[PDB]
């Protein structure tokens, strides 16, 4: 299986437009990564991480994005906050894993790197595995916004300010969420 295309990948999408990759028809070894001791965060919900690749699922999805350390605690079952409510939400019945590592050396930049965006405004919260690219002018006042920014009419996406001399809580982190789908279909992803 081509995990190197997801983890050791060159470019990562920002969290508002996170990147889902489908994985099927290959043999995967999980214990290469968990015992690699290369990630700062590796939490698996549902299945035991300890050598339980003795299963076969229909499909395997890998969702990659970039956030900050303060927000890593939000990529977890039943968590609430900016990222979970407005950017990327996981369901309570999560049969999967979340991995994350500090990418301060690759996503920061002197004077700030403002290439990663996060959604700061939304009328409702995101359903599990929803994805919102709507750059509609969020309405915070009584006036309808009519697509133009102005008094009480803010753009929904806002930049990350990734200076390298940040505290760890403010530094960029790369996150990959693995979901294991077992539907009523021929299972092909075994170990």
């Amino acid at each position, epitope marked *: 299986c081509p995990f190197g295309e997801v983890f050791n990948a060159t470019r990562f999408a920002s969290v508002y437009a996170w990147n889902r990759k489908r994985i099927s028809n290959c043999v995967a070894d999980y214990s290469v990564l968990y015992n690699s001791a290369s990630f700062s965060t590796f939490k698996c919900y549902g299945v035991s991480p300890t050598k339980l690749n003795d299963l076969c699922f229909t499909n395997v999805y890998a969702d990659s994005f970039v956030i*900050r350390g*303060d*927000e890593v*605690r*939000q990529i977890a079952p039943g*968590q*609430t*906050g*900016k*990222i979970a*409510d*407005y950017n990327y939400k996981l369901p309570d019945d999560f049969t999967g894993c979340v991995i994350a590592w500090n990418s301060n050396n690759l996503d920061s930049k002197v004077g*700030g790197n*403002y290439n990663y965006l996060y959604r*700061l*405004f939304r009328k409702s*919260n995101l359903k599990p595995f929803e994805r919102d690219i709507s750059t509609e002018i969020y309405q*915070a*006042g*009584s006036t309808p916004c009519n697509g133009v*920014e*102005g*008094f*009480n009419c*803010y*753009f929904p996406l*806002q*930049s990350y*300010g990734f*200076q390298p001399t*940040n*505290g760890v*809580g*403010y530094q960029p982190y790369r996150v990959v969420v693995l979901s294991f789908e077992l539907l009523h279909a021929p299972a092909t992803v075994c170990g």
Partner: antibody
Amino acid sequence: EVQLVESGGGLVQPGGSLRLSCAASGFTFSSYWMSWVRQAPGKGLEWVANIKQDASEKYYLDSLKGRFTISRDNAKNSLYLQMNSLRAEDTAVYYCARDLGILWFGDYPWGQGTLVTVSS
Amino acid sequence: DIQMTQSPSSLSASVGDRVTITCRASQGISNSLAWYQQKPGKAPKLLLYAASTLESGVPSRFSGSGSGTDFTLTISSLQPEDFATYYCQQFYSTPRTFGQGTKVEIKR
């Protein structure tokens, strides 16, 4: 990190003026409004001024009666507040905040305001 | 213009207690309300916005509910660092207006 640094507070006599500055860094200064919020001696937050991204719109508290003028220079990532005809009641710690309706104040330790003390 | 009123203005509680602060507006403002924490002498810090969503970096013990004219801020298990004054603001119109604040004290 959102770093907002206030400067310019001091002792002014009643009727005098003062000009406060707010140096900003850690975010795109052009994408946000900017607000000035003061806090009197042990008396809680009172929003006083608001300036747009391109500074084409400015909003104030009518209590101030046109004594205050908000300004911003984007090239310098800087916000300014000109306080004219100062009254004793203007004695307060003044903070600048990044604005999108919501106020983000300066992260620790950078953001901590400047103290205006108006007295005869 | 829009008036904000906080309750109970001064609240005494203990560590590990569950704490709720109430904030009401003189007119409806949908969910365009935010909650801030200020420790003595320091600058205010944004805890919650849009009535319910936690700003990143805030401990998950802080949560907010409400809409229309009624809002509640809730800390699940009070910790020693949570004793401070709390303010609510609205970003529905100008002038931007704060609540008078409620001081959270230590119960003895």
